[PDB]
Amino acid sequence: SFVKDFKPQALGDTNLFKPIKIGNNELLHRAVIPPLTRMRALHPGNIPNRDWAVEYYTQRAQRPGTMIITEGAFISPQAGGYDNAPGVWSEEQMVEWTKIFNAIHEKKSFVWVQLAVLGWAAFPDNLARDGLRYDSASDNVFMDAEQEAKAKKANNPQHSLTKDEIKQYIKEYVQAAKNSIAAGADGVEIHSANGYLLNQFLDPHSNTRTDEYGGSIENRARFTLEVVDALVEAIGHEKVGLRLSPYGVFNSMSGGAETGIVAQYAYVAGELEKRAKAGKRLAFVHLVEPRVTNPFLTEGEGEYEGGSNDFVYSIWKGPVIRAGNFALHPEVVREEVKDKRTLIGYGRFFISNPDLVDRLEKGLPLNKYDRDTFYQMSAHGYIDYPTYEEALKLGWD
């Protein structure tokens, strides 16, 4: 059914519906599909779902000129640990991704692959089964007691990466980016948010290292910036974006409770602008808003009111995608898009509304989402949410 009590607003008269260029892509509107893990990939081999993934992305590409960022895709087996999330390291994976990218392009939309590395969020038992390490920045602080226990039980204790192992990940990022472009993607997004491996290096709670990769703002940012630089070299700055969540607490990150958190992220933005001014500007910076510090809490919950991402705009001068509880808040979007380099990512409601862009333009009711099927091995709750037309025919009004 439709979300009850929601009072839609037509946003067609705002900059949300003004075209903008991101990297090589001429977007026709500024409603972006942010990366959304759905867990339909099949085991073994982390293969994008052979039955439904093309349809899922085709549905959500239906509005011409939409920028789509894929679900997180593992750069290598060592980077993974969830059996049903896809990878981008193998030929068998790329066969399916190619079909997906082709379908999106047939609909005249665009696709950016999010490159994912789990670190301490991985399942240590899956990794042990596959002969792989359980990795993080440090080895003396853990995501939670359950993860620490699972690792010990699996004889796969959390391991602090060596410098050589960091270089190996960088090699894998480079190859994953190359694979993505070769299969037809428009670009990649480096995931450095939501408490996954790169975020584990950025955050002083999870990073207690005393080598060059920890112990200061510059050191904590080193790994993320090395990945940025490696990918810019490999496939070009116009095909690379970076995602950050300064105020996130998901996966045991610090958020605003850490008084140095804004400085840490301001440093990263500054280093990106420095590179931009020296001729290599990333396609975009993608920020998760303090509106959503944990995306598995219902909209309105876990909202941090003691911080703003506005600081980034004083530093980074390129496009900024902002995501977090915007679908139910057109009044906030109306104000944010007055800034002419701001795009809006809509996550959970793009899960439930394949024609979300039409609904935003025209001020239509939104399909409620079913959180139970966010992660599920099913077409149900994946490719069977109706368009507005289909919803009316089903009597949802």
Ligand X SMILES: Cc1cc2nc3c(=O)[nH]c(=O)nc-3n(C[C@H](O)[C@H](O)[C@H](O)COP(=O)(O)O)c2cc1C
d(CA 20, CA 128): 45
Tokens for 337, please give them.
């898009």
Question: For residue 212, how many C-alpha atoms fall within 13 Å in the half-sphere facing its CB?
Answer: 9
Choose between 124 and 347: whose C-beta lies nearer to ligand X.
347
Backbone angles phi, psi at 311, to 5 degrees: -50, -35
Backbone angles phi, psi at 135, to 5 degrees: -105, 145
**Contacts with ligand X, 47-86, as mask; x by CB under 6 A:** ------------------------xx--------------
d(CA 310, CA 314): 7
Question: What is the residue type of 26?
Answer: E
For residue 348, say whether it is annotated as part of any ligand binding site. yes
For residue 29, say whether it is annotated as part of any ligand binding site. no
**Contacts with ligand X, 252-271, as mask; x by CB under 6 A:** --------------------
Question: Residues 307, 210, 240, CA angle at the centre, nearest 5°?
Answer: 55
In the annotation, is 196 catalytic? yes
Indicate the pairing of strand 20-22 with strand 25-27.
antiparallel
313 binds, among ligand X, Cl ion, ligand 4EG, none (CB under 5 to 8 A by kind): Cl ion
Query: Helical H runs in the chain?
Result: 53-60, 91-106, 124-129, 145-153, 163-182, 197-202, 217-220, 222-235, 261-277, 311-315, 330-336, 348-352, 356-362, 388-393
For residue 375, say whether it is annotated as part of any ligand binding site. yes
Backbone angles phi, psi at 179, to 5 degrees: -60, -45
How many chain residues are in contact with ligand X, going by CB under 6 A?
23
**Contacts with Cl ion, 289-318, as mask; x by CB under 5 A:** ---------------------x--x-----
How many chain residues are in contact with ligand 4EG, going by CB under 6 A?
8
310 binds, among ligand X, ligand 4EG, Cl ion, none (CB under 5 to 8 A by kind): Cl ion
Q: Indicate whether 37 belongs to the interface with ligand 4EG (CB under 6 A).
A: yes
CB contact at 8 A, 94 and 49: no
Point out the residue whose Cβ comes nearest to Cl ion: 313
Least separation in angstroms between CB 314 and ligand X: 22
Residue of the chain from 57, 82, 369, 388 that contacts ligand 4EG (CB under 6 A): 82
Q: Indicate whether 194 belongs to the interface with ligand 4EG (CB under 6 A).
A: yes
Q: Indicate whether 46 belongs to the interface with ligand X (CB under 6 A).
A: no
Catalogue the active-site residues. Answer: 196
Contacts to ligand X by CB under 6 A? 34-37, 71-72, 114, 191, 193-194, 243, 288, 292, 295, 323-327, 346-348, 374
Contacts to ligand 4EG by CB under 6 A? 37, 72, 74, 82, 85, 116, 194, 295
